[PDB]
Amino acid sequence: GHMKDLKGTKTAENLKQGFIGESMANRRYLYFAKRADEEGYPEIAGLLRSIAEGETAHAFGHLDFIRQGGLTDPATDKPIGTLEQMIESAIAGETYEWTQMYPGFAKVAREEGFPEVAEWFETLARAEKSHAEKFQNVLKQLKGGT
């Protein structure tokens, strides 16, 4: 029982990268499943969806080791030990997306001659602003307010 700290280790970075790849895999497989669905391949669609559940299990297990080891959220570098911390992590990521990421992407898309992509990024910025506000309302309630 020689217990070591994950902070600042390569393993900590590897758990974060594992989480990213697992997250992408579930999204990709469910996206692919819709193409199988369209074209009439229910067994392929079903396999994609079942393997996607595996990737959920993998992502969540990475997060368990991250949280239990006192590492931060891969997306935000904020702690995710408690429910309030998790909501704070949500708010930080949403805030980054609507105040920095998506408006910057929309500006670049317009500069590069991709106005339809820019309008999408603008739509998303508005959506993440909404998400942030709604998470802020839950945080206020968790902290004992209205």
Add this chain to the structure above:
Amino acid sequence: GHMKDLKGTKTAENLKQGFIGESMANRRYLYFAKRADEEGYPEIAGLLRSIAEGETAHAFGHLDFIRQGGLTDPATDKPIGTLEQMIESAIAGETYEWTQMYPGFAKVAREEGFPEVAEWFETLARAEKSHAEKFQNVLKQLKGGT
């Protein structure tokens, strides 16, 4: 109607990074929802799950622009225009994970004194090998075989 190619643009990289962040957000929010569930916060859990659906919509829309613009899969740098290409992308990512990513992570985890994390990475390598084989079997069927 002055149509430009997304390949090699900043916008192409921004769609990929958008996809990564959206993927992580859906995973994180569903993970957070389970903590809300445990502790008896059904309205918070429900909000997390509903916002997670938004993040699905966002991720899938990024993939639509990627695919429609002839860009490759953020996770594998493989085309994802057709169902067979999507399955090939799945196989490539699974193959990377079991033949390189997870065994390398397990080796590093053991070196750094994290055997329980290593055993997890070893479990995952075995799982991704299984996923690869099962996707390879579907690809063989899509190509007209048994």
